[PDB]
Scaffold this active site. Structure first.
Site, PDB file in Angstrom:
ATOM      1  N   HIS A  12      -0.796  -6.337   0.600  1.00  8.66           N
ATOM      2  CA  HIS A  12       0.740  -5.872   0.543  1.00  8.66           C
ATOM      3  C   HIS A  12       1.503  -7.218   0.887  1.00  8.66           C
ATOM      4  O   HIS A  12       2.305  -6.869   1.351  1.00  8.66           O
ATOM      5  CB  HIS A  12       0.432  -5.027   1.809  1.00  8.66           C
ATOM      6  CG  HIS A  12      -0.673  -3.714   1.157  1.00  8.66           C
ATOM      7  ND1 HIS A  12       0.073  -2.818   0.221  1.00  8.66           N
ATOM      8  CD2 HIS A  12      -1.741  -3.000   1.346  1.00  8.66           C
ATOM      9  CE1 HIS A  12      -1.017  -2.154   0.491  1.00  8.66           C
ATOM     10  NE2 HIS A  12      -1.471  -2.116   1.235  1.00  8.66           N
ATOM     11  N   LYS A  41      -5.228   0.366 -10.050  1.00  7.69           N
ATOM     12  CA  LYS A  41      -4.585   1.074  -8.575  1.00  7.69           C
ATOM     13  C   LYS A  41      -2.871   1.710  -8.963  1.00  7.69           C
ATOM     14  O   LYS A  41      -2.576   1.018  -9.580  1.00  7.69           O
ATOM     15  CB  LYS A  41      -4.413   0.195  -7.243  1.00  7.69           C
ATOM     16  CG  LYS A  41      -3.741   0.488  -5.766  1.00  7.69           C
ATOM     17  CD  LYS A  41      -4.012  -0.058  -4.472  1.00  7.69           C
ATOM     18  CE  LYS A  41      -3.257   0.471  -3.475  1.00  7.69           C
ATOM     19  NZ  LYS A  41      -3.393  -0.370  -2.255  1.00  7.69           N
ATOM     20  N   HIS A 119      -2.807  -1.302   6.941  1.00  9.23           N
ATOM     21  CA  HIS A 119      -2.457  -0.315   5.585  1.00  9.23           C
ATOM     22  C   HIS A 119      -1.301   0.189   5.531  1.00  9.23           C
ATOM     23  O   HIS A 119      -0.542   0.273   6.569  1.00  9.23           O
ATOM     24  CB  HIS A 119      -3.387   1.204   5.458  1.00  9.23           C
ATOM     25  CG  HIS A 119      -5.147   1.721   6.457  1.00  9.23           C
ATOM     26  ND1 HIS A 119      -6.006   1.360   4.735  1.00  9.23           N
ATOM     27  CD2 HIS A 119      -5.848   1.924   7.201  1.00  9.23           C
ATOM     28  CE1 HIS A 119      -6.964   1.460   5.212  1.00  9.23           C
ATOM     29  NE2 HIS A 119      -6.556   1.674   6.423  1.00  9.23           N
ATOM     30  N   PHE A 120      -1.331  -0.236   3.945  1.00  6.12           N
ATOM     31  CA  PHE A 120       0.565   0.300   4.004  1.00  6.12           C
ATOM     32  C   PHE A 120       0.414   1.943   3.654  1.00  6.12           C
ATOM     33  O   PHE A 120      -0.653   2.335   2.378  1.00  6.12           O
ATOM     34  CB  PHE A 120       0.624  -0.394   2.614  1.00  6.12           C
ATOM     35  CG  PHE A 120       2.625   0.149   2.716  1.00  6.12           C
ATOM     36  CD1 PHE A 120       3.080   0.546   1.645  1.00  6.12           C
ATOM     37  CD2 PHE A 120       3.260  -1.559   3.138  1.00  6.12           C
ATOM     38  CE1 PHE A 120       4.192   1.021   1.486  1.00  6.12           C
ATOM     39  CE2 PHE A 120       4.843  -1.287   2.818  1.00  6.12           C
ATOM     40  CZ  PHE A 120       4.841  -0.717   2.490  1.00  6.12           C
ATOM     41  N   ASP A 121       0.795   2.752   4.933  1.00  5.61           N
ATOM     42  CA  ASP A 121       0.936   3.762   4.303  1.00  5.61           C
ATOM     43  C   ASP A 121       1.879   4.275   3.646  1.00  5.61           C
ATOM     44  O   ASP A 121       2.205   5.479   2.321  1.00  5.61           O
ATOM     45  CB  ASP A 121       1.498   4.949   5.916  1.00  5.61           C
ATOM     46  CG  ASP A 121       0.603   6.054   5.868  1.00  5.61           C
ATOM     47  OD1 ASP A 121      -0.825   6.561   5.541  1.00  5.61           O
ATOM     48  OD2 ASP A 121       1.704   7.309   5.451  1.00  5.61           O
TER      49      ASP A 121
HETATM   50  O1  LIG Z   1       3.968   3.587  -1.234  1.00  6.88           O
HETATM   51  C1  LIG Z   1       3.422   2.965  -0.904  1.00  6.88           C
HETATM   52  C2  LIG Z   1       1.921   4.020  -1.397  1.00  6.88           C
HETATM   53  C3  LIG Z   1       0.795   4.039  -1.419  1.00  6.88           C
HETATM   54  N1  LIG Z   1       0.250   2.657  -1.359  1.00  6.88           N
HETATM   55  C4  LIG Z   1      -1.190   2.457  -1.578  1.00  6.88           C
HETATM   56  O2  LIG Z   1      -1.350   3.560  -2.022  1.00  6.88           O
HETATM   57  C5  LIG Z   1      -2.771   3.880  -1.674  1.00  6.88           C
HETATM   58  C6  LIG Z   1      -2.967   5.238  -1.617  1.00  6.88           C
HETATM   59  O3  LIG Z   1      -1.919   5.867  -2.018  1.00  6.88           O
HETATM   60  P1  LIG Z   1      -1.284   7.482  -1.611  1.00  6.88           P
HETATM   61  O4  LIG Z   1      -2.963   8.401  -1.380  1.00  6.88           O
HETATM   62  O5  LIG Z   1      -0.318   7.533  -1.068  1.00  6.88           O
HETATM   63  O6  LIG Z   1      -0.874   7.579  -3.062  1.00  6.88           O
HETATM   64  C7  LIG Z   1      -2.722   2.950   0.259  1.00  6.88           C
HETATM   65  O7  LIG Z   1      -3.787   3.397   0.693  1.00  6.88           O
HETATM   66  C8  LIG Z   1      -2.070   1.941   0.177  1.00  6.88           C
HETATM   67  O8  LIG Z   1      -2.927   0.669  -0.819  1.00  6.88           O
HETATM   68  C9  LIG Z   1       1.371   1.399  -1.403  1.00  6.88           C
HETATM   69  O9  LIG Z   1       0.760   0.469  -1.548  1.00  6.88           O
HETATM   70  N2  LIG Z   1       2.676   1.778  -1.420  1.00  6.88           N
END
Ligand SMILES: O=c1ccn([C@@H]2O[C@H](COP(=O)(O)O)[C@@H](O)[C@H]2O)c(=O)[nH]1
Length: 124
Positions: A12, A41, A119-121
């Site tokens: 991230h 991903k 974690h990026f939420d």
């Molecule tokens: O705006 C976002 C939303 C999700 N994720 C990544 O996707 C994963 C899960 O996304 P979701 O479960 O919200 O679809 C997160 O753990 C994160 O690593 C992001 O990088 N940015």
């Protein structure tokens, strides 16, 4: 080895640019940060801010995580970010991403001691 904090940095953080490098930024970064190695991903966000600025978010607005857990934090300032989202053609092993530059508040999950992002939420 890779600590949860270092994982977050690899997935991230991209402090080296203030914004997404080019059309192909996401394809290149999702590859080089080893995110697409076993599946594509669906979405992944890179943050174009200092590591210290992002770590500082763990001391800011406590909010509910998407999963309902309570160790998430929303940044007071908006931050320069790039969302890499799969396109319709994207299909393992040939992941393909669209690059969207944005300035939004970020939400991270923080854990550990010191209490850092793991974690990026979400962004908002
Ligand atoms: O705006 C976002 C939303 C999700 N994720 C990544 O996707 C994963 C899960 O996304 P979701 O479960 O919200 O679809 C997160 O753990 C994160 O690593 C992001 O990088 N940015």
């Amino acid at each position: 080895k890779e600590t949860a904090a270092a994982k977050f940095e690899r997935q991230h953080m991209d402090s080296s640019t203030s914004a997404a490098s080019s059309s192909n930024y996401c394809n290149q970064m999702m590859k080089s940060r080893n995110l697409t190695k076993d599946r594509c991903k669906p979405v992944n966000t890179f943050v174009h801010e200092s590591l210290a600025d992002v770590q500082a978010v763990c001391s800011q607005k406590n909010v509910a995580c998407k999963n309902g857990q309570t160790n998430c934090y929303q940044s007071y300032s908006t931050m320069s970010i790039t969302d890499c989202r799969e396109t319709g053609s994207s299909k393992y092993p040939n992941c393909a991403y669209k690059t969207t530059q944005a300035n939004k508040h970020i939400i991270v999950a923080c854990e550990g001691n010191p209490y850092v992002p793991v974690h990026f939420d979400a962004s908002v």
